[PDB]
Structure formats: structure tokens, C-alpha cells
């Protein structure tokens, strides 16, 4: 795989994609040879992500070629720009790639990061899902209970609401749950739902053209170890994708 | 599911 030659993309490897929905900095993937670290920041519809490739061996990686894979429909909604990476990674060395990100419109698919390189003549080919998700363009909005209910009532049309009941994956810990909601990009609104055990959030999704207001309600049932999540937003596909993402976090 | 939602959650937000 000298420049201009690639192998077919490897099937997706197991990675830490879901751990990066509500967090931005950490290790996305690691095997015996390579560590892929991420650091990112986002503001309104823009972001900047740094990818760190760490060679855990004493042997050089040669022809080291990272490619971001995005279908045409995703490219229409999510603009990624990057710069070349040196194809030689020394043993024990770490190399950095910058990805500049613009959300054009809401989107569901995730970019795939494919990495091909030579390790002592072996062919290495790794494909991992990159955690650029719709909620990265979510700006928290604090608001009063009265403002929330006015907006919630407007979004009463069924197309605006997506609801999901699911079994808890993690301990039903109030403090961890609040931190997940904040890490998702939502404000955490206290004393809106008259049930003190429930969680309410609000924010705005920023695209190149449009601000999409979003409201959320998360209801635990501690005994049954279940949750009910309700999204009401000003765009049907945003309600769907945010509910899909947040439903996997508790 | 509607009944599970009945028994485990609700009522509607105000």
C-alpha cells in the first residue's frame, strides 16, 4: 500500500465509540500494536478533533495511511477536512492528525476511520467508528420551568416526539446520570418535572443553517431497573437520532 | 409496552 494503493477496508473492529458520545477525550481503540487516542472540542456547528496514533512496539510502522470513510449522504451533512500524516511511525512514537468538522445538517451515520500500515512485513488494516455524533453540535440552554413547559407543549405533534423504554445498562446512580446528560451537551434543568427522581434537559442543535431546539425527559424506574426517555425537538430526524444516542448511555 | 409504560412511568409532563 504505497501511496495511491489501498486494501479493501477491514470489517469494523470493536472500539469505544459509545463511550465517546458523552465524553470527548480518551482512547478510542487499542490493540497490541497501536493506540488510537482522541481529543476534541465543539462550538455550535463546528468542531476540531485530534487523533493520536501511538506505536506501542519497537518496530516502525510503514506506509501508515489513515483514511476517513464517509458515504456521500454523510458527506452532504457533515464536512470533514484533514491534513496528510507522515507514513512512517517510529517505534514508541506518537503522531497526530487534525480533523476540522462542520455540521451542515443533522446526520445519523458515523465516519469510519480506517488505518492501513506495514508492521515488519505484516499487513495491518483496522476500521473503527469515529465518535462524531449529532449531539456534538448540541449547545446547552438553561431555562425556567415556565419556558420549558411552553416549548414542550408546542412540540406536542407526534412527529416531534420520540420515546423509548429500555433496560438500564449501568447502575442507576443519580450523580452519574446527571453528568452523562451534561456530557451529552444538554443543560440539566432542576425542578421542572415535579417528580424529583426524573431528569429534564434542554439544548439547541446547531447546523450550518438552522438552530433546532431540543427538550428531553429521562424517567428512571429504580425497582424495575428501566428507563423511559422522551425527546421533543423541532425536527423529527433530530428527535430520532438524539433518542437513539441517549438511549445507549444509561 | 404501553402497559409497561403505564405501570413504570408517567404521568405526562404537566
Amino acid at each position: 500500500g504505497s501511496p495511491g494503493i489501498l486494501a479493501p477496508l477491514a470489517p469494523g473492529s470493536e472500539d469505544n465509540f459509545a463511550r465517546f458520545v458523552c465524553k470527548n477525550n480518551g482512547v478510542l481503540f487499542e490493540n497490541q500494536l497501536l493506540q488510537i487516542g482522541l481529543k476534541s472540542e465543539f462550538r455550535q456547528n463546528l468542531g476540531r478533533m485530534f487523533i493520536f496514533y501511538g506505536n506501542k512496539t519497537s518496530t516502525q510502522f510503514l506506509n501508515f495511511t489513515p483514511t476517513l470513510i464517509c458515504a456521500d449522504d454523510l458527506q452532504t451533512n457533515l464536512n470533514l477536512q484533514t491534513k496528510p500524516v507522515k507514513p512512517t511511525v517510529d517505534g514508541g512514537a506518537q503522531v497526530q492528525q487534525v480533523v476540522n468538522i462542520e455540521c451542515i445538517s443533522d446526520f445519523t451515520e458515523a465516519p469510519v476511520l480506517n488505518i492501513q500500515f506495514r508492521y515488519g512485513g505484516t499487513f495491518q488494516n483496522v476500521s473503527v467508528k469515529l465518535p462524531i455524533t449529532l449531539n456534538k453540535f448540541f449547545q446547552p440552554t438553561e431555562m425556567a420551568s415556565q419556558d420549558f413547559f411552553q416549548r414542550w407543549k408546542q412540540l406536542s405533534n407526534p412527529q416531534q416526539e420520540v420515546q423509548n423504554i429500555f433496560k438500564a445498562k449501568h447502575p442507576m446512580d443519580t450523580e452519574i446520570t446527571k453528568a452523562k446528560i451534561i456530557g451529552f451537551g444538554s443543560a440539566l434543568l432542576e425542578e421542572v418535572d415535579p417528580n424529583p427522581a426524573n431528569f429534564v434537559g434542554a439544548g439547541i442543535i446547531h447546523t450550518k443553517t438552522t438552530q433546532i431546539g431540543c427538550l428531553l425527559r429521562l424517567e428512571p424506574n429504580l425497582q424495575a431497573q428501566m428507563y423511559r426517555l422522551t425527546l421533543r425537538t423541532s425536527k423529527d430526524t433530530v428527535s430520532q437520532r438524539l433518542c437513539e444516542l441517549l438511549s445507549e448511555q444509561f | 409496552e404501553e402497559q409497561v409504560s403505564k405501570n413504570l412511568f408517567g404521568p405526562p409532563l404537566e
Side-chain angles (χ1 to χ4, degrees):
Chain A
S2 51
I5 292 87
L6 288 176
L9 307 178
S13 280
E14 287 300 45
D15 58 62
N16 297 320
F17 175 90
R19 305 185 74 71
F20 282 84
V21 174
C22 300
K23 182 174 44 61
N24 283 316
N25 303 332
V27 173
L28 178 63
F29 172 89
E30 188 164 346
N31 67 8
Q32 78 282 6
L33 301 182
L34 171 69
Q35 185 194 77
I36 305 176
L38 296 179
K39 302 179 188 302
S40 60
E41 301 289 336
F42 293 85
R43 181 194 183 269
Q44 301 183 17
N45 77 316
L46 303 177
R48 181 172 291 149
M49 162 180 295
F50 293 97
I51 308 171
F52 296 83
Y53 303 107
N55 182 344
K56 304 168 64 184
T57 85
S58 46
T59 311
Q60 283 184 324
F61 296 162
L62 305 177
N63 292 331
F64 191 83
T65 306
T67 310
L68 300 168
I69 308 295
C70 282
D72 47 17
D73 281 326
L74 181 56
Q75 291 194 42
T76 299
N77 292 316
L78 180 68
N79 184 253
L80 305 181
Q81 297 182 66
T82 191
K83 309 158 208 203
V85 177
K86 201 307 171 202
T88 307
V89 191
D90 292 339
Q94 191 182 56
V95 188
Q96 179 181 306
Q97 183 177 356
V98 57
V99 185
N100 286 296
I101 306 157
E102 177 162 26
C103 174
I104 306 289
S105 198
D106 60 297
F107 62 97
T108 289
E109 301 187 332
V112 165
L113 177 64
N114 175 257
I115 313 283
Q116 295 182 29
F117 59 100
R118 312 297 298 301
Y119 172 63
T122 61
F123 295 82
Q124 302 301 317
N125 188 342
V126 174
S127 295
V128 295
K129 274 222 298 183
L130 201 70
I132 301 172
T133 53
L134 179 59
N135 65 291
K136 301 300 175 177
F137 309 101
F138 205 15
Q139 168 185 81
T141 56
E142 303 289 344
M143 66 180 75
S145 169
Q146 181 276 147
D147 299 322
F148 183 92
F149 280 108
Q150 178 74 355
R151 294 153 185 275
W152 188 263
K153 191 150 136 223
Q154 169 59 30
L155 301 172
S156 59
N157 273 17
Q159 149 193 129
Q160 314 306 134
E161 179 182 273
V162 176
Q163 187 173 81
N164 189 34
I165 294 172
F166 59 90
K167 189 72 203 24
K169 290 183 188 25
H170 307 303
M172 293 180 85
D173 186 312
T174 299
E175 300 301 295
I176 297 183
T177 295
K178 290 182 174 186
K180 271 301 205 331
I181 292 170
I182 292 165
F184 192 70
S186 181
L188 187 72
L189 303 186
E190 301 287 347
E191 299 183 356
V192 172
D193 187 325
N195 190 333
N198 293 343
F199 309 87
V200 172
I204 293 169
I205 287 289
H206 286 265
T207 77
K208 178 164 179 174
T209 55
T210 312
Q211 292 189 12
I212 297 150
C214 304
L215 312 172
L216 64 91
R217 184 193 195 193
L218 181 66
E219 302 168 73
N221 189 295
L222 300 181
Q223 170 170 18
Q225 287 169 310
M226 302 290 296
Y227 284 100
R228 186 168 74 165
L229 176 65
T230 308
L231 269 290
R232 283 188 187 192
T233 86
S234 56
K235 187 168 185 183
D236 64 335
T237 48
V238 172
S239 300
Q240 186 63 54
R241 180 52 173 163
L242 297 181
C243 192
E244 176 170 41
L245 284 164
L246 245 190
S247 285
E248 297 305 320
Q249 296 298 314
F250 308 97
Chain B
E1 163 152 87
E2 165 189 351
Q3 264 294 332
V4 166
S5 211
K6 164 158 179 64
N7 290 343
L8 300 187
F9 307 109
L13 206 31
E14 188 164 279

